[PDB]
């Protein structure tokens, strides 16, 4: 049963904060083919080698895909410290993980283009005490708490957003800021792969 | 949203090797009521306290229920070495675990009684040589590889079962043996509670 990477090739890819994840188990994959459909600019892996994913059988493959400017290629990994790593997307690095940057070809009409690239500059929680900032750093494999108050596409750089937390939650406000980067002629997307050694039933496994 | 322990209170419970797992997420539970409907004969916990589960909140609650004789309560834990721990049911002991032994009251008509109590004396794998035996000890939170060849209720103690594994599986035969303990007047059942700490935590609280 071949792994279904169809959802990626159809639709406007989401922004980094609202990234889309496909979790594959009990399937066989051809990563060379998926990357054939795209123009790859960088493919750097941490606790795995791109070859070993294509030469070895593992329990699960997780592909998180999003629209990301190659202008910020350095910022995606935790090697570089900045807003994306702190408040937008974090892989469970230390586990076998790969980050790829790609430009969508003119041929790939199914992958549509966003109006602009957008990201969260900061997501923070101001407390009722006015003790103020308790910045909400992103958790790996999870979404920023500010995705509720941050628009799918940020209208303007420096846009600021707010939500009032319930008394039960502890009172206070959730505050966020947005930053925008202009869209390229061809969409530049970013792909995150996390492979898990797992125990038995090594199931994702090359073609 | 109350946790639904309803699947347990309706139907003939499975045998230990065929344990039924109910995973509860984003629900609230009162284990006092569930145990209230039964006559508890033991509530022993490791790495957790009966009452801490009732006083604190955890990411998930797993209850595994099965028909088990009180004759074998000593054997159920990893503390005692023997077939149930080796080839039938093993919990993640290092993780918080509770093992509960209870008798179904005459009032609980919905929990029906099996015709006898059954367990796997041995699950072993003869290899391609037709001599080598690799005993298939049960992994935790998983079923025996022999559940396919072992009957849901064993007709006679010492019954033997066989399956030929395909050449792709490494070849060989899968062999198993079964043991029978007579049914009591009132069904005696076994329950396994495993709770998990997590980033959210507030998923399975009490009350």
């Amino acid at each position: 049963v071949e792994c279904d990477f169809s959802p990626l090739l159809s639709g406007t890819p989401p922004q980094v904060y609202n990234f889309k994840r496909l979790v594959f188990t009990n399937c066989n994959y051809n990563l060379t083919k998926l990357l054939s459909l795209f123009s790859v600019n960088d493919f750097t892996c941490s606790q795995i080698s791109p070859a070993a994913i294509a030469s070895n059988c593992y329990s699960s493959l997780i592909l998180d895909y999003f629209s990301y400017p190659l202008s910020m290629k350095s910022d995606l990994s935790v090697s570089s410290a900045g807003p994306i790593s702190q408040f937008n997307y974090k892989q469970s690095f230390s586990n076998p993980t790969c980050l790829i940057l790609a430009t969508v070809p003119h041929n790939l009409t199914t992958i549509t283009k966003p109006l602009k690239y957008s990201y969260i500059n900061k997501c923070s929680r101001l407390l009722s005490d006015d003790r103020t900032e308790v910045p909400q750093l992103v958790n790996a494999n999870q979404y920023s708490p500010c995705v509720s108050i941050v628009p799918s596409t940020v209208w303007e750089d420096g846009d600021y957003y707010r939500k009032q937390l319930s008394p039960l939650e502890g009172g206070g406000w959730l505050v966020a800021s947005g930053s925008t980067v202009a869209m390229t002629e061809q969409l530049q997307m970013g792909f995150g792969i996390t492979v898990q050694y797992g125990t038995d039933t090594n199931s994702v496994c090359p073609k | 949203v109350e946790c639904d322990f309803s699947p347990l209170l309706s139907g003939t419970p499975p045998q230990v090797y065929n344990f039924k797992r109910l995973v509860f997420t984003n629900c609230n539970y009162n284990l006092t009521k569930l145990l209230s409907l039964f006559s508890v004969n033991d509530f022993t916990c490791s790495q957790i306290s009966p009452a801490a589960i009732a006083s604190n909140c955890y990411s998930s609650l797993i209850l595994d229920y099965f028909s088990y004789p009180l004759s074998m309560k000593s054997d159920l834990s990893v503390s005692s070495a023997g077939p149930i721990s080796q080839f039938n049911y093993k919990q993640s002991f290092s993780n918080p675990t509770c093992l509960i032994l209870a008798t179904v009251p005459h009032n609980l008509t919905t929990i029906t009684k099996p015709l006898k109590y059954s367990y796997i004396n041995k699950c072993s794998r003869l290899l391609s040589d037709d001599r080598t035996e690799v005993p298939q000890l049960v992994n935790a939170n998983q079923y025996s590889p022999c559940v396919s060849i072992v009957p849901s209720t064993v007709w006679e103690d010492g019954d033997y079962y066989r399956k030929q594994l395909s050449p792709l599986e490494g070849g060989g035969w899968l062999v198993a043996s079964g043991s029978t303990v007579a049914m009591t007047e009132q069904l005696q059942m076994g329950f396994g509670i495993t709770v998990q700490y997590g980033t959210d935590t507030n998923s399975v609280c009490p009350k």
Epitope: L137, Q142 | N56, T199
Partner: nanobody, 131 residues
């Protein structure tokens, strides 16, 4: 029972470096955010930074190049390294854990509390920097 205790405070001559401690009591594991703040007398509490277990840190942009935050997950202590300390830095340095997605747990007892609805504030330590 759960509390945080700061340490390493005292007197440093200007240009010096001090590393402070915020040990936590009553929790085997913390999945939450531990953060450092400074309050001068007559001045508001100002965020120094926030850290999580992975090593991810946020700096206030004024503590850039001088203040650093570290965490020891076992021995649950968060630390602040302050360098080129100057007289203006003299203030009370306090630490907080809480209000941050993850949970505080004691594996020995089975206790768990959600940091989103809970927070702990440390007593405080004073850094006096003199010429």
């Amino acid at each position: 029972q759960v509390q945080l205790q700061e340490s390493g405070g005292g007197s440093v001559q200007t240009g010096g470096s001090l590393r402070l401690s915020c040990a936590g009591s009553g929790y085997t594991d913390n999945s939450c955010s531990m953060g450092w703040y400074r309050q001068a007398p007559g001045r508001e509490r100002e965020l120094i930074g926030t850290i999580i277990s992975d090593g991810t840190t946020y700096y206030s942009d004024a503590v850039k190049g001088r203040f650093t935050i570290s965490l020891d997950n076992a021995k649950n202590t968060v630390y602040l390294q302050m360098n080129n300390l100057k007289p203006e830095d003299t203030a009370m340095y306090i630490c907080n854990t809480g209000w941050s997605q993850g949970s505080l747990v004691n594996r020995t007892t089975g206790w768990t509390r959600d940091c989103w609805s809970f927070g702990i504030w440390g007593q405080g330590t004073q850094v006096t920097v003199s010429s």
